[PDB]
Each structure stands twice: as structure tokens, then as C-alpha cells.
Amino acid sequence: ATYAQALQSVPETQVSQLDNGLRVASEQSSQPTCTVGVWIDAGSRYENEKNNGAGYFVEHLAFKGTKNRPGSALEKEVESMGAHLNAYSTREHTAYYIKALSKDLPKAVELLADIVQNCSLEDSQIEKERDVILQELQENDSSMRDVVFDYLHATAFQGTPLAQSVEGPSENVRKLSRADLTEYVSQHYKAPRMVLAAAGGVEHRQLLDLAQKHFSSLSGTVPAFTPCRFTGSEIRHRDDALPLAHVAIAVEGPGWANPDNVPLQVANAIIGHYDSTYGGGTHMSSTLASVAATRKLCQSFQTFNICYAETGLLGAHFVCDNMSIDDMMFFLQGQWMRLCTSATESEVVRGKNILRNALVSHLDGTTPVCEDIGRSLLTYGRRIPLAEWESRIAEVDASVVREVCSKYFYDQCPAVAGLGPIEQLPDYNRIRSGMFWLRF
Amino acid sequence: IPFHPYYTIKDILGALFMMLILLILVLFSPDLLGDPDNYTPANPLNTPPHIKPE
Numbered sequence: 001a002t003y004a005q006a007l008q009s010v011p012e013t014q015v016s017q018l019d020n021g022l023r024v025a026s027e028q029s030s031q032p033t034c035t036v037g038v039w040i041d042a043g044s045r046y047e048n049e050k051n052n053g054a055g056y057f058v059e060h061l062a063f064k065g066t067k068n069r070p071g072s073a074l075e076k077e078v079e080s081m082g083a084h085l086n087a088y089s090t091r092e093h094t095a096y097y098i099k100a101l102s103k104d105l106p107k108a109v110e111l112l113a114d115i116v117q118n119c120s121l122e123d124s125q126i127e128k129e130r131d132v133i134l135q136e137l138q139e140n141d142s143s144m145r146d147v148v149f150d151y152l153h154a155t156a157f158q159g160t161p162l163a164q165s166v167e168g169p170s171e172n173v174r175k176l177s178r179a180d181l182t183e184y185v186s187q188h189y190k191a192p193r194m195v196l197a198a199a200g201g202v203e204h205r206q207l208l209d210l211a212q213k214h215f216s217s218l219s220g221t222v223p224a225f226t227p228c229r230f231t232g233s234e235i236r237h238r239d240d241a242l243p244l245a246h247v248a249i250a251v252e253g254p255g256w257a258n259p260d261n262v263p264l265q266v267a268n269a270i271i272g273h274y275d276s277t278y279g280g281g282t283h284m285s286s287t288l289a290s291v292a293a294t295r296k297l298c299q300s301f302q303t304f305n306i307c308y309a310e311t312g313l314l315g316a317h318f319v320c321d322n323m324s325i326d327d328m329m330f331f332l333q334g335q336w337m338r339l340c341t342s343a344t345e346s347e348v349v350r351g352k353n354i355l356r357n358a359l360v361s362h363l364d365g366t367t368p369v370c371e372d373i374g375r376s377l378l379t380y381g382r383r384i385p386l387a388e389w390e391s392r393i394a395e396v397d398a399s400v401v402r403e404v405c406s407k408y409f410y411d412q413c414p415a416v417a418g419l420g421p422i423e424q425l426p427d428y429n430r431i432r433s434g435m436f437w438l439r440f
Numbered sequence: 441i442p443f444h445p446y447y448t449i450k451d452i453l454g455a456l457f458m459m460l461i462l463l464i465l466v467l468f469s470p471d472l473l474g475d476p477d478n479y480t481p482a483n484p485l486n487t488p489p490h491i492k493p494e
Binding site: 429 | 441442444445446
């Protein structure tokens with residue numbers, strides 16, 4: 001095996017389609033366990049101002065009870081056979097996946113139908129979950145990372161559904177009724193926008209039979225979203241009582257398909273990530289990370305590439321003390337402009353290797369593989385095989401990075417969200433002026 | 441607010457306005473704020489009709 005035969009030997013994910021539009025997809029393997037899940041194309045991006053937060057509410061109510069399985073009965077099946085049921089709802093996706101033994105695949109799929117098709121949405125359950133969601137919102141206020149990322153989305157996609165948080169405003173939480181949830185599950189859990197994805201030791205024929213036997217009686221065969229408008233701005237939630245100051249600066253990134261995703265990730269891999277409790281520190285080849293470790297500017301930073309269907313945020317988020325925001329912002333902008341102006345071959349090779357490690361290591365275990373299947377089928381319309389990813393990364397070079405970063409970073413108005421003791425944070429004019437070089 | 445991105449350009453505008461006034465003065469009416477008797481060689485034996493300072 002020379003890593004080429006290795007990639008070629010990865011089992012192929014068969015994809016089918018029911019009459020309802022259910023894209024049944026599976027990736028057989030040898031493990032005795034499996035992860036079977038349903039990926040919905042619902043999320044806050046598809047929610048108006050009044051309906052905002054209904055997706056999170058429905059996700060919460062999903063596992064409580066079903067019409068066929070009243071209340072804890074649904075729970076009882078999950079634990080009694082050792083399965084781990086879980087759900088996650090981001091801004092443009094929802095998913096319910098049940099990790100279970102390959103033997104129990106016939107049962108799990110049935111449950112996966114019951115959770116998605118025949119929910120309960122009981123009124124007393126709605127009241128209890130309303131209280132729980134309120135306390136969970138007060139929890140989410142605690143950590144600065146999620147708060148800062150929601151601020152970034154609000155100030156970058158202001159005036160668009162993308163600005164809406166996943167959980168929604170607390171006002172909507174109290175004022176969401178059972179009718180709204182029923183309408184949401186009726187008009188957003190439709191059959192065409194569904195991916196039943198399974199990994200592990202499941203054969204595609206059995207998955208197709210189970211889907212055709214349990215998911216057949218679903219929707220037949222509309223809120224198809226609108227292109228959101230990036231609006232470079234800044235939000236400063238100056239709160240000096242917080243210990244550290246979380247900043248996130250992002251530019252309008254690429255879409256989901258948008259082949260420029262492959263170079264940009266490589267470019268981001270050049271900047272990398274770092275925090276206090278790392279290893280080499282002052283020797284890590286990422287110049288920004290080496291500077292941070294040498295001068296102890298920050299307790300953390302990372303480069304994110306949040307990309308949605310038609311747009312996306314590409315940038316960096318760092319956590320540092322109250323009197324190092326300016327220096328680290330300068331060094332971050334310097335790394336960005338260096339990549340746009342002069343990328344150099346060696347850094348590009350390091351980025352290519354790092355991205356190869358990302359894609360390969362991320363796709364291990366049944367849960368990440370099934371998640372990749374669902375997300376790829378929903379976004380790319382296919383499952384990009386690892387060989388295709390390898391070829392696309394191989395095509396990347398110094399010139400490609402220098403051009404792609406230039407198209408997205410150089411002289412672009414960024415969106416900034418800072419929270420905490422952010423007095424040091426440079427004024428938006430200084431940040432914007434950092435995007436361009438008078439030497440270049 | 442930081443001085444450079446804002447007050448440098450504000451001061452540039454102020455300097456432009458002051459240059460406008462000064463250049464108007466010099467180019468169009470130079471001997472407006474002066475006194476014509478200053479264009480006479482100093483003669484200690486005779487004084488001008490009025491002795492006013494600037």
C-alpha cells in the first residue's frame with residue numbers, strides 16, 4: 001500500500017433514491033457496529049423571524065415520545081439494545097443518528113422513521129421543553145465561543161435568515177406554540193430534502209428494503225431559501241468583567257461546492273491553530289502560532305471555514321487577554337496578506353499534507369463517516385470520494401493559493417465580532433486597512 | 441478612537457481650508473492686512489501720519 005492503493009481501496013458508498021425522493025445511502029464495511037441516521041435539510045436558515053427557534057424546539061421534542069412509542073418507550077428501545085441516539089441541528093442541517101449494533105439495524109431504522117415521521121409534540125411536553133430551552137439559552141450565554149460566533153453571523157449576514165441563531169430569540173421560545181411546530185415539521189421534513197445515511201456493517205440492499213418498508217408512507221414527490229447578503233460590519237460587546245476577550249474576524253468565503261474550497265482550506269492549514277496547552281509551541285511552523293507561543297499573546301486561536309450553500313464565512317477566531325488584541329490582530333492580518341502576496345511552495349506543501357490528514361483522519365469510525373455521507377449528499381449532491389479529494393489537493397500549488405487568497409482576502413471588507421475586554425481591539429477602519437498592503 | 445484613521449484626515453481637511461484662506465489672501469489681496477506706509481524707506485526724521493502696530 002502506497003497511500004494510492006489505500007485510497008483506491010476505500011469501499012464505495014452506494015447511493016439510491018426512493019420514489020418519495022429519499023436518498024438512501026450507505027457505506028458498507030466490516031465493523032459489527034453501525035451508525036444509521038437521517039439528515040434533514042431544515043435549519044434556522046429556513047426559518048422566518050416569527051418561526052425562528054422552531055427547529056431547535058422540534059429537535060428537543062424529537063426524542064421525548066412518538067405516536068407509536070409513547071414517551072419513554074422510545075427511550076426504552078434505544079438503551080435496552082445499547083444504541084446511542086443523538087441529534088444535532090445546525091443553521092442549515094438537522095440530523096438524528098442512532099449508533100447501534102449491525103444486527104439491530106432493522107429496529108433502529110424503524111425508530112428513525114418514528115422520530116422523524118410520527119412525532120408527538122404534546123402540549124405539556126412543549127411547556128416543559130420551553131422551560132428547558134430557556135435554561136439552555138442561559139447556559140449558552142456562558143461560553144464566549146458560541147456567543148462570539150453567533151455575533152459574527154448576526155453582523156455578517158444582517159438582514160437575512162442566516163443571521164438568525166439556531167436556538168432563536170428567547171421571545172420566540174416563549175411564544176412558539178404547537179401549531180408552529182406542527183407546520184414546521186410538515187413543511188420542512190418533506191421527503192425530497194431527506195438523506196437516510198448509514199455506515200458500518202450495513203449492506204445497501206438491506207438499507208433500501210428497510211427504507212422502502214418504513215419510510216415509504218412519507219411526503220409525496222416552497223421555502224427554497226434566498227441568497228443571503230454578506231455585509232461587512234462589526235459588533236463589540238464590551239464587557240470588561242469577562243476574563244478573556246474572544247474575537248472572530250471573517251470574510252465572505254466560498255459556497256459549499258465552489259472548488260476554491262480546496263485551496264482555501266490549504267491556506268488556512270498554513271495558519272493552523274494553537275492554544276496554551278500545546279506541544280512544540282515556539283517551534284511550530286505556523287508563523288502566527290510561533291509568534292503567539294513566543295510572546296504569549298493568546299490562550300487560543302483557530303482558522304474556521306464555515307461555508308453555507310451560497311456563501312460562507314472564512315477567517316480566524318482567537319482568544320487572548322485584554323492587552324494583546326491589537327498585536328495578534330496585526331500578526332493575523334500579516335499572515336493573511338503574506339499568503340495572498342507570496343505563498344511560497346514549502347508552506348503550500350505543508351498545507352496540502354495537513355489537509356490530507358484532516359480529510360483522512362476525520363473519516364474514521366462509523367459516526368463521522370455516516371455524518372460525512374449525510375452532509376455531502378445534502379450539500380455537494382454526491383459523496384466526494386477520498387481519491388477525488390486527493391486529486392483536488394494535489395492540483396493545488398503556490399500560485400493557486402496566492403490567487404485564491406487574493407480573491408477572498410486582499411482588500412475585502414471583513415466582519416468582526418468581539419466580546420469581553422475588547423478596548424484594545426482596533427477600530428474598524430484600522431482592521432479594514434489591515435486587509436491591504438502599501439508595499440504590494 | 442484611534443487618532444490615525446480619523447483625525448489625520450480631519451486635520452488634512454483643516455489644513456486644506458487654512459491653505460485656502462491663506463492662498464486667497466496672498467494671491468488675490470496681499471496688502472489687505474498690512475499698512476501701505478510700510479512700503480516707504482525708514483526715515484527717522486519724519487513719522488507717518490499714524491503709528492499703528494500689526
